[PDB]
Motif scaffolding. Structure first.
Motif, mmCIF file in Angstrom:
data_model
loop_
_atom_site.group_PDB
_atom_site.id
_atom_site.type_symbol
_atom_site.label_atom_id
_atom_site.label_comp_id
_atom_site.label_asym_id
_atom_site.label_seq_id
_atom_site.Cartn_x
_atom_site.Cartn_y
_atom_site.Cartn_z
ATOM 1 N N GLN A 159 -7.281 -9.434 0.454
ATOM 2 C CA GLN A 159 -8.779 -9.012 0.416
ATOM 3 C C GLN A 159 -9.609 -9.057 1.673
ATOM 4 O O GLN A 159 -10.284 -8.397 1.880
ATOM 5 C CB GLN A 159 -9.141 -10.196 -0.644
ATOM 6 C CG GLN A 159 -10.606 -10.201 -0.848
ATOM 7 C CD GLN A 159 -11.313 -8.810 -1.163
ATOM 8 O OE1 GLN A 159 -10.607 -8.261 -1.894
ATOM 9 N NE2 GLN A 159 -12.343 -8.323 -0.553
ATOM 10 N N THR A 160 -9.529 -10.222 2.515
ATOM 11 C CA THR A 160 -10.349 -10.155 3.771
ATOM 12 C C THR A 160 -9.750 -9.261 4.541
ATOM 13 O O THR A 160 -10.729 -8.364 5.407
ATOM 14 C CB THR A 160 -10.270 -11.760 4.083
ATOM 15 O OG1 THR A 160 -10.751 -12.644 3.601
ATOM 16 C CG2 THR A 160 -11.145 -11.640 5.733
ATOM 17 N N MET A 161 -8.756 -8.901 4.746
ATOM 18 C CA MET A 161 -8.198 -8.069 5.526
ATOM 19 C C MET A 161 -8.548 -6.636 5.220
ATOM 20 O O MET A 161 -8.502 -5.531 6.081
ATOM 21 C CB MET A 161 -6.473 -8.113 5.683
ATOM 22 C CG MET A 161 -6.241 -9.081 6.441
ATOM 23 S SD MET A 161 -4.362 -9.383 6.555
ATOM 24 C CE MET A 161 -4.000 -8.045 7.843
ATOM 25 N N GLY A 162 -8.611 -6.385 3.811
ATOM 26 C CA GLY A 162 -9.035 -5.191 3.121
ATOM 27 C C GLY A 162 -7.943 -4.149 2.833
ATOM 28 O O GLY A 162 -8.111 -3.092 2.306
ATOM 29 N N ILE A 163 -6.790 -4.774 2.563
ATOM 30 C CA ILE A 163 -5.752 -3.962 2.240
ATOM 31 C C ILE A 163 -5.809 -3.726 0.693
ATOM 32 O O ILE A 163 -5.467 -2.491 0.203
ATOM 33 C CB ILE A 163 -4.418 -4.950 2.234
ATOM 34 C CG1 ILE A 163 -4.044 -5.372 3.836
ATOM 35 C CG2 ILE A 163 -3.150 -4.216 1.575
ATOM 36 C CD1 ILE A 163 -4.164 -4.384 4.760
ATOM 37 N N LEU A 164 -6.525 -4.762 -0.175
ATOM 38 C CA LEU A 164 -6.725 -4.371 -1.567
ATOM 39 C C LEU A 164 -7.601 -3.006 -1.911
ATOM 40 O O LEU A 164 -7.322 -2.230 -2.611
ATOM 41 C CB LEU A 164 -7.292 -5.178 -2.069
ATOM 42 C CG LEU A 164 -6.600 -6.892 -2.223
ATOM 43 C CD1 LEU A 164 -7.031 -7.703 -3.032
ATOM 44 C CD2 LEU A 164 -5.061 -6.700 -2.757
ATOM 45 N N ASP A 165 -8.556 -2.883 -0.783
ATOM 46 C CA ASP A 165 -9.403 -1.752 -1.029
ATOM 47 C C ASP A 165 -8.798 -0.382 -0.935
ATOM 48 O O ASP A 165 -8.934 0.446 -1.683
ATOM 49 C CB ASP A 165 -10.520 -1.593 0.251
ATOM 50 C CG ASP A 165 -11.458 -2.677 0.058
ATOM 51 O OD1 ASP A 165 -11.587 -3.652 -0.959
ATOM 52 O OD2 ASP A 165 -12.256 -3.216 0.889
ATOM 53 N N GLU A 166 -7.565 -0.238 -0.072
ATOM 54 C CA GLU A 166 -6.772 1.062 0.043
ATOM 55 C C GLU A 166 -6.005 0.910 -1.535
ATOM 56 O O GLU A 166 -5.813 2.199 -1.907
ATOM 57 C CB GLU A 166 -5.895 0.717 1.244
ATOM 58 C CG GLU A 166 -5.228 2.277 1.629
ATOM 59 C CD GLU A 166 -4.672 2.062 3.010
ATOM 60 O OE1 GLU A 166 -4.811 1.067 3.406
ATOM 61 O OE2 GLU A 166 -4.402 3.044 3.465
ATOM 62 N N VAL A 167 -5.501 -0.058 -1.991
ATOM 63 C CA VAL A 167 -4.868 -0.126 -3.349
ATOM 64 C C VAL A 167 -5.779 0.350 -4.478
ATOM 65 O O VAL A 167 -5.291 1.237 -5.340
ATOM 66 C CB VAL A 167 -4.202 -1.503 -3.625
ATOM 67 C CG1 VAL A 167 -3.403 -1.403 -4.799
ATOM 68 C CG2 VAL A 167 -3.150 -1.710 -2.273
ATOM 69 N N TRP A 168 -6.862 -0.091 -4.319
ATOM 70 C CA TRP A 168 -7.818 0.267 -5.422
ATOM 71 C C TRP A 168 -8.216 1.737 -5.719
ATOM 72 O O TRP A 168 -8.420 1.990 -6.696
ATOM 73 C CB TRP A 168 -9.223 -0.238 -5.229
ATOM 74 C CG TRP A 168 -9.125 -1.967 -5.395
ATOM 75 C CD1 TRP A 168 -9.548 -3.066 -4.771
ATOM 76 C CD2 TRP A 168 -9.281 -2.312 -6.885
ATOM 77 N NE1 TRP A 168 -9.595 -3.993 -5.374
ATOM 78 C CE2 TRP A 168 -9.444 -3.757 -6.862
ATOM 79 C CE3 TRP A 168 -9.102 -1.863 -8.276
ATOM 80 C CZ2 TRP A 168 -9.379 -4.627 -8.064
ATOM 81 C CZ3 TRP A 168 -9.318 -2.488 -9.414
ATOM 82 C CH2 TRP A 168 -9.307 -4.022 -9.198
ATOM 83 N N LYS A 169 -7.975 2.475 -4.589
ATOM 84 C CA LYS A 169 -8.058 4.189 -4.460
ATOM 85 C C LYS A 169 -7.056 4.623 -5.309
ATOM 86 O O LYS A 169 -7.330 5.486 -6.173
ATOM 87 C CB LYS A 169 -8.175 4.633 -3.114
ATOM 88 C CG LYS A 169 -9.406 4.206 -2.251
ATOM 89 C CD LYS A 169 -9.229 4.865 -0.948
ATOM 90 C CE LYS A 169 -10.431 4.446 -0.091
ATOM 91 N NZ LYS A 169 -10.380 4.979 1.370
ATOM 92 N N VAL A 176 0.796 -1.187 -0.036
ATOM 93 C CA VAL A 176 -0.179 -0.017 0.024
ATOM 94 C C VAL A 176 0.821 1.269 -0.037
ATOM 95 O O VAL A 176 0.483 2.151 -0.803
ATOM 96 C CB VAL A 176 -0.965 -0.109 1.396
ATOM 97 C CG1 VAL A 176 -1.516 1.236 1.282
ATOM 98 C CG2 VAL A 176 -2.060 -1.049 0.933
ATOM 99 N N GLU A 177 1.992 1.279 0.832
ATOM 100 C CA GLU A 177 2.733 2.418 1.015
ATOM 101 C C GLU A 177 3.616 2.786 -0.368
ATOM 102 O O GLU A 177 3.617 3.954 -0.664
ATOM 103 C CB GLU A 177 3.806 2.388 2.033
ATOM 104 C CG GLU A 177 3.985 3.716 2.951
ATOM 105 C CD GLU A 177 2.925 4.123 3.592
ATOM 106 O OE1 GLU A 177 2.102 3.358 3.956
ATOM 107 O OE2 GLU A 177 2.922 5.502 3.883
#
Ligand code: SF4
Ligand SMILES: [Zn+2]
Ligand SMILES: [Zn+2]
Ligand SMILES: [Zn+2]
Ligand SMILES: [Zn+2]
Lengths: 356, 130, 752
Positions: C555-565, C527-528
């Motif tokens: 995906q479950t942790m939600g790390i991808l959601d931050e990357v999608w932005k 993410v960083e």
């Protein structure tokens, strides 16, 4: 060696200034200032924040832009919530733009930026512009990503077809689209995409954009522009103004329809004829006849006088001669005058003093 | 749709679940909407088909999609395709109604530096007195 | 420009030239003049293919010998890139010399990549395409049509049209790429595949993948047409051993044996059917077999054997048929018993590793199959299949595997090992036994190449250490060196990350893949970095399974959601077509400016030829050392063989194998000296691997970057990206990293 170190640095700085030729420049300009107000602009790399400093420098740029380009017009656009927001119509009034920016200084930035939206709005705003004007777009980009509804490539091609010019100032790193936008829009030139390296360096970049950009040889458009010179008149009683319809003590009288105006330079609201003063054109004269840079005199030869010709400042004795001569008139000058004569003034006193 | 591994334990909703089979058909339709010939430069299909008679030891389970005890796919590959399909749709939506390979391969840095083509004007100074 | 070497004039296709390229050309000319093999390592940031082609082409045109050139790559995509450089190279020569010199250069690939038939190019497997193409091009259809026009068998217009014109007039003089070749052939209704095959002997330069030079199945036909004194170039040969081993490897499963018996029974039934009605064909084949003729003397040039020779041409016996498999029915019984013998060996309850001699001895004990008859199984099958009128060979396809297995095991006995495992996948409810014939020695299939050709050049961007390759592959080199780029300003920032922002060590060890602490640390790194990476980011994982599991955890942790932005997420998939679409989308996303991050496997399809030059690759995140699966019988047998034979430690080879792949991905980001990027290696085990990296990468790795944290590494990356963005001073590279014609002449004067 410490004193010599400063001298050699001055020579290196003077190295770039040596190559000066009277390039053709478009004095008449139409600028669309685009500022990025997105989530990426909330960082603290620039104190207090990017948005605050950018707005502050924007006000200074507006003051400087109109000071040296009195016969130019500017417009302001902002990107917010993935949409382009218009905050000031294209106009020749510097106060209107400054007032709009001040109000913007309060609202917090949020959302994502959309270059395609901003460029599309700029294209529309520049459509009703005379062909003799130079269409320029100053974009302040801080985000490393762009979210757009359509194809950015198509817009870039449209921008080229409209003879628009784009200057982009980055904050963090290089963006592929910005390089392509600044390259394809400037005949392949790669010097129109600039990234600041610190807080101070940003001030120079904004100041640099003030000077009119040189025109391309192939993009040559020559025409005669009809203009007028109104005569200031003093009235004993206030009268309605043809621009704002408000009581004012007096105003300039248009020579084409006698309609009065409040402030200059502006297009007459009645005959749509650009009204200006002789001073307004005079300022842009230095861009047409730039003063040739002075060349330092080597210490090997013998100097003419121990004091400056224009300021009568004794030249310090101290390795390196502290004298600069003008090739046109062969008059030595001190370091202080040369900076003053090439930044404040634009005429060499030695050349004028010489009779013919 | 959120690209998360569906859990059998989750009850879900009876009404919405009726459309799960329809989505499978939609994904197949969407796959064709994105399928198109690819340039040979980045054509990974031909790399594996370059020698159609390659015979070798099968790759270890670490180089193959994960499977469960029963041998069927664990389904985490599906979400990868779902996320991959979602990204493809977004890019395609941008290109709405509203030679090249050679240039890309060439090294720009080795070419001659760009030369400015700005114009120069020399102005004569002479006019009648007022 | 056009500068001169001691006696060779060379026309460079650019007004400028890098110092490394000039050194590259001079050394190559020295190798060609002196003869022998050489190993050259160049940084990925300098044009290697263009420099190599310019010198080699000039060498052929100037010297009276006019030696032909053989260019070898690792994938079809690389062939396309090489051809483009040649096309660009020839254009410069034509414009400078004032005329188009007599030159022919064509690429080569399988039928699937060059088939234009509307009904045969729509297949998902090349084996079916070859079968369908063979059916319409074997000659039976043409002969049948001539005898009886009413026959419904069809032909190929593209193939037929070639007979009208001569071979020398198939294509105009010049260089034809696959993109251009297809367009030219489409407008004239001609087969690019057959044109390429029939013009190899006439092409000045031929470009094809390694599989067409090392694999006996397809190399024999191609190798028989090229010259013996031609120049050989091994481009990107840092993974040549893997290609060499898979050439002489085979896999056998229970299903394959199960389908083999059905084909054998079908083959027996077909013989009986032919015997009743047309028994003369069997006698005709038998009569020819008695004297000692083989497929070469029986099969015509238009047709090809059903089973490709799995052994090298030099290892096949030239003796007549032993007699046991001389007849159709007798051979089937021989084949049938062999299949059953394999089946009964598939019931072992534990892993068994035995040498080919041991397998042959047990075979000679339980049954009475001798070694010599077993070697002609593939050779005999092709003759029987051809004479049986088996136009449809769907049932007989499985028998190819059995014939291939018999020939390989009965031919070679040293350096080959046979592995039988009761569980192909340990994570399975029911056993699925597999039988693997593995090749341990990596020099067996490459030995003929180094002997047939005099001068061979092995070049790659990340071929290090150079001393190991001569040890692994039995050949000697006149000179071996690696060039270091003389870049005026640092362009790439290689750094090693050993711990996360929490000061906790991070590693990609398989046993702790589902580690809550490591997953978050890697997730934070992704993410960083995605926040500061301007356009594109490539992530390489040690293996698909590790990537598959960890991505699900994110995906479950939600790390991808931050990357999608910040960026679009593209994921490599086992399907080749889907992965190709991802690259197109990834490139499209990077181009417009939306930003995209690609997750791939270091040993996957992306890393074997796909390049991420400039905007496409700006930050590379190597998630862990791409170590192979240690608990693998194939790898363990190979490791032991090297230790006993070449005295290479198992740990040393394992580290070399992983580094050679990690370095491979690192070099796919820089094209010229104007490119820049950051190479981050996220594992505590990289700290001690600096010496094993390529020299041009090691030199750029500072001593302070051996062990870094996530927070510290990010700041360095941000500073590096900002600094590189500034305009470069031309004087800083006028004559130190970039040379003009005047600068080159000055160097030639000072050196001389
Ligand atoms: S001859 Fe050529 S075009 Fe015809 S089927 Fe074979 S490969 Fe395809
Ligand atoms: Zn007014
Ligand atoms: Zn008026
Ligand atoms: Zn002075
Ligand atoms: Zn003067």
């Amino acid at each position: 060696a410490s004193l010599v170190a400063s001298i050699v640095e001055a020579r290196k700085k003077r190295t770039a200034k040596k190559n000066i030729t009277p390039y053709q420049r478009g004095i008449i300009r139409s600028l669309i200032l685009t500022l990025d107000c997105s989530e990426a602009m909330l960082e603290k790399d620039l104190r207090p924040n990017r948005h605050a400093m950018i707005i502050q420098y924007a006000i200074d740029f507006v003051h400087e832009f109109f000071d040296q380009n009195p016969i130019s017009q500017m417009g302001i656009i902002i990107m917010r919530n993935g949409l382009a927001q218009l905050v000031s119509q294209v106009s020749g009034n510097p106060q209107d733009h400054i007032d709009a920016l001040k109000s913007i200084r309060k609202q917090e930035p949020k959302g994502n930026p959309s270059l395609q939206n901003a460029l599309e709005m700029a294209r529309g705003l520049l459509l009703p512009v005379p062909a003799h004007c130079t269409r320029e777009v100053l974009i302040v980009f801080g985000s490393l990503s762009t979210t757009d509804p359509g194809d950015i490539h198509q817009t870039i091609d449209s921008l080229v077809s409209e003879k628009i010019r784009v200057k982009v100032l980055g904050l963090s790193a290089q963006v592929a689209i910005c390089k392509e936008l600044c390259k394809a829009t400037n005949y392949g030139d790669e010097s129109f995409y600039k990234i600041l390296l610190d807080e101070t360096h940003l001030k120079e970049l904004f100041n640099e954009a003030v000077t009119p950009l040189p025109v391309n040889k192939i993009n040559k458009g020559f025409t005669l522009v009809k203009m007028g010179f109104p005569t200031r008149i003093f009235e004993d009683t206030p009268t309605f103004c043809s621009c704002h319809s408000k009581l004012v003590y007096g105003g300039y009288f248009c020579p084409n329809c006698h309609s009065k105006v409040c402030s200059l330079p502006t297009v007459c609201p009645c005959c749509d004829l650009m009204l200006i003063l002789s001073t307004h054109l005079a300022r842009s004269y230095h861009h047409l006849m730039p003063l040739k840079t002075f060349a330092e005199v080597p210490t090997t030869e013998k100097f003419r006088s121990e004091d400056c010709f224009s300021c009568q400042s004794r030249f310090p004795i101290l390795l390196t001669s502290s004298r600069y001569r003008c090739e046109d008139c062969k008059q030595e000058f001190c370091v202080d005058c040369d900076v003053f004569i090439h930044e404040i003034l634009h005429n060499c006193p030695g050349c004028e003093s010489k009779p013919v | 749709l959120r690209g998360e591994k569906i859990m059998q334990n989750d009850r879900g909703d009876v009404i919405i679940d009726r459309y799960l089979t329809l989505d499978q058909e939609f994904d197949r339709k969407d796959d064709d909407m994105l399928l198109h010939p690819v340039k040979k430069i980045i054509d990974l299909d031909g790399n594996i088909q370059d020698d159609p008679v390659v015979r070798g030891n099968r790759p270890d389970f670490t180089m193959q999609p994960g499977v469960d005890i029963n041998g069927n796919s664990d389904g985490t590959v599906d979400i990868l395709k779902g996320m991959n399909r979602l990204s493809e749709k977004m890019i395609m939506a941008l290109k709405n109604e509203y030679n090249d390979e050679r240039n890309e391969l060439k090294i720009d840095d080795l070419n001659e530096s760009y030369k400015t083509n700005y114009a120069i004007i020399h102005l004569k100074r002479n006019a009648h007195e007022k | 420009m056009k500068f001169y070497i001691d006696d060779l004039p060379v026309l460079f296709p650019y007004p400028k030239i890098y110092p490394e390229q000039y050194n590259y050309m001079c050394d190559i000319k020295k190798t060609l003049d002196v003869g022998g093999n050489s190993i050259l390592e160049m940084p990925s940031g300098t044009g290697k293919t263009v420099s190599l082609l310019s010198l080699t082409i000039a060498y052929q045109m100037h010297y009276p010998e006019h030696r032909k050139i053989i260019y070898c790559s690792r994938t079809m995509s690389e062939i396309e890139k090489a051809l483009v450089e040649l096309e660009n190279l020839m254009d410069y020569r034509t414009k400078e010399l004032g005329y188009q010199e007599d030159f022919r250069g064509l690429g080569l690939t399988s039928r699937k990549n060059l088939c234009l038939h509307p009904e045969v190019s729509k297949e998902r497997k090349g084996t079916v395409v070859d079968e369908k193409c063979r059916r319409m091009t074997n000659g039976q259809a043409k002969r049948k049509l001539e005898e009886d026009p009413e026959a419904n068998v069809e032909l190929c217009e593209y193939h037929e049209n070639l007979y009208n014109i001569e071979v020398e007039d198939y294509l105009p003089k010049g260089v034809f790429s696959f993109e251009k070749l297809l367009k030219y052939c489409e407008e004239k209704t001609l087969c690019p595949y057959f044109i390429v095959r029939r013009m190899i002997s006439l092409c000045n330069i031929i470009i094809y993948s390694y599989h067409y030079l090392l694999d006996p199945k397809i190399a024999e036909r191609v190798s028989n047409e090229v010259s013996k004194d031609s120049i050989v170039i091994f481009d990107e040969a840092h993974n040549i051993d893997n290609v060499c081993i898979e050439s002489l490897s085979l896999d056998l499963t229970t299903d394959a044996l199960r389908r083999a018996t059905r084909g054998a029974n079908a083959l027996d039934e077909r013989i009986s059917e032919v015997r009743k009605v047309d028994s003369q064909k069997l006698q005709d084949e038998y009569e020819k077999l008695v004297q000692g003729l083989h497929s070469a003397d029986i099969l015509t040039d238009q047709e090809e054997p059903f089973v490709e020779t799995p052994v090298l041409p030099q290892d096949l016996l030239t003796e007549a048929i032993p007699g046991n498999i001389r007849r159709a029915e007798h051979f089937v019984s021989f084949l049938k018993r062999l299949i059953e013998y394999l089946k009964t060996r598939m019931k072992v309850l534990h892993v068994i590793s035995e040498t080919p001699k041991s397998f042959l001895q047990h075979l000679k004990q339980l049954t009475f199959i001798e070694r010599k008859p077993l070697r002609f199984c593939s050779e005999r099958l092709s003759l029987l299949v051809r004479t049986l009128e088996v136009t449809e060979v769907e049932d007989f396809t499985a028998l190819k595997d059995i014939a291939t297995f018999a020939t390989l095991i009965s031919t070679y006995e040293e350096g080959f090992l046979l592995i039988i495992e009761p569980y192909e996948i340990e994570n399975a409810a029911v056993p699925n036994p597999i039988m693997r014939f593995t090749c341990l020695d990596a020099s067996i299939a490459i030995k003929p190449v180094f002997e047939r050709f005099s001068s061979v050049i092995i070049t790659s961007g990340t071929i290090s250490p150079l001393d190991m390759y001569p040890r692994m592959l039995n050949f000697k080199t006149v000179l071996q060196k690696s060039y270091a780029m003389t870049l005026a300003k640092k362009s790439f920032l290689p750094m090693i990350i050993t711990k996360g922002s929490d000061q906790v060590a991070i590693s990609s060890r398989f046993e702790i893949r589902n580690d809550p602490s490591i997953v978050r640390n890697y997730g934070s790194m992704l993410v960083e970095f995605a926040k500061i990476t301007p356009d594109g980011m490539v992530v390489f994982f040690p293996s698909y399974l590790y990537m598959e599991s960890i991505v699900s955890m994110w995906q479950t942790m939600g790390i991808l959601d931050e990357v999608w932005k910040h960026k679009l997420i593209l994921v490599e998939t086992p399907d080749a077509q889907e992965t190709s679409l991802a690259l197109e989308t990834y490139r499209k996303a990077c181009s417009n400016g939306r930003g995209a991050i690609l997750l791939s496997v270091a040993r996957g399809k992306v890393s074997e030829g796909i390049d991420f030059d400039h905007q496409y690759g700006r930050t590379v995140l190597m998630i862990g050392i791409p170590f192979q699966y240690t608990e693998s019988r194939i790898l363990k047998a190979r490791l032991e063989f090297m230790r006993e034979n070449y005295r290479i430690r198992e740990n040393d080879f394992l580290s070399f194998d992983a580094m050679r792949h990690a370095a491979q991905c690192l070099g796919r980001v820089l094209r010229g000296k104007d490119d820049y990027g950051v190479m981050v290696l996220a594992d505590r085990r990289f700290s001690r691997k600096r010496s094993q990296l390529p020299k041009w990468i090691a030199q750029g790795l500072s001593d302070a970057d051996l062990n870094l944290s996530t927070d510290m590494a990010i700041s360095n990356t941000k500073q590096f990206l900002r600094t590189m963005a500034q305009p470069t001073d031309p004087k800083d590279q006028e004559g130190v990293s970039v040379w003009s014609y005047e600068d080159l002449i000055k160097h030639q004067n000072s050196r001389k």
